[PDB]
């Protein structure tokens, strides 16, 4: 596309500049162009990809919720039309991310740290599609998260931040999307407890990384119990 003529390294550099400038649409477009160079992404580059699209879809989700709420309360065509406009834009972003994962980030990801990361993203962006959808979208989210969980439990320690963030998101999928609040609560507790028992093996910096995400599991359990 329009980033085809820019060097991979220049795209990565500009993604980091756009992050500093809080220009997340640009950041996402730079990272899409880097992915489309066809090379695998490093850990830092995967994180740039995810942060970029998470910020873009987050603005869309927030706006969609405002509009959906106004629409529900109002129940002219304008509120429905504009909610649909934002909804379609959100679906388009989700489709773009899923497209990058399917062509060809996941199939070329052999290491656990990269394969789990991408499968988690796949679960997340189908979850964002499910928020606005439906049964098949939910099963697509579930399937991606489950594959990621199975790999993470065999190949990563229970304190691994990627594993922790995956379990966090899968628990929210259970609570809100799958209407399985007991599964959500069970997952959050087991994940928290198995991480707690492994903190003693960590350096100070790794301890900080793992406990930050453990605090998110705790925040959810507090809202859920």
């Amino acid at each position: 596309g329009a980033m085809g003529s820019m060097e991979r390294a220049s795209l990565i550099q500009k993604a980091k500049l756009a992050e500093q400038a809080e220009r997340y649409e640009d950041m996402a477009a730079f990272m899409k162009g880097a992915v489309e160079k066809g090379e695998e992404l490093s850990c830092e580059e995967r994180n740039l990809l995810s942060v970029a699209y998470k910020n873009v879809v987050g603005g869309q989700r927030a706006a969609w919720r405002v509009l959906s709420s106004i629409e529900q309360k109002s129940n002219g065509p304008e509120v429905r039309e504009y909610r649909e406009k934002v909804e379609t834009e959100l679906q388009g972003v989700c489709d773009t991310v899923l497209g990058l994962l399917d062509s060809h980030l996941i199939k070329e990801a052999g290491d656990a740290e990269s394969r789990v990361f991408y499968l988690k993203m796949k679960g997340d962006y189908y979850r964002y599609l499910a928020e606005v959808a439906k049964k098949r979208i939910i099963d697509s989210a579930r399937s991606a998260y489950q594959e990621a969980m199975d790999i993470s439990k065999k190949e990563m320690p229970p304190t691994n931040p990627i594993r922790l963030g995956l379990a966090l998101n899968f628990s929210v999928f259970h609570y809100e999307i799958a209407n399985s609040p007991e599964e959500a609560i069970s997952l959050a507790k087991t994940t928290f407890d198995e991480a707690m028992a492994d903190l003693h093996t960590l350096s100070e910096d790794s301890y900080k990384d793992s406990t930050l995400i453990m605090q998110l599991l705790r925040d959810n359990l507090t809202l859920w119990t």
């Binding site: 942060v51 966090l168 998110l216 809202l223």
Partner: peptide, 12 residues
């Protein structure tokens, strides 16, 4: 809507 904690930027 009440939004629960998920990984990464809290951008919504």
């Amino acid at each position: 809507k009440l939004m629960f904690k998920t990984e990464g930027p809290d951008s919504d």
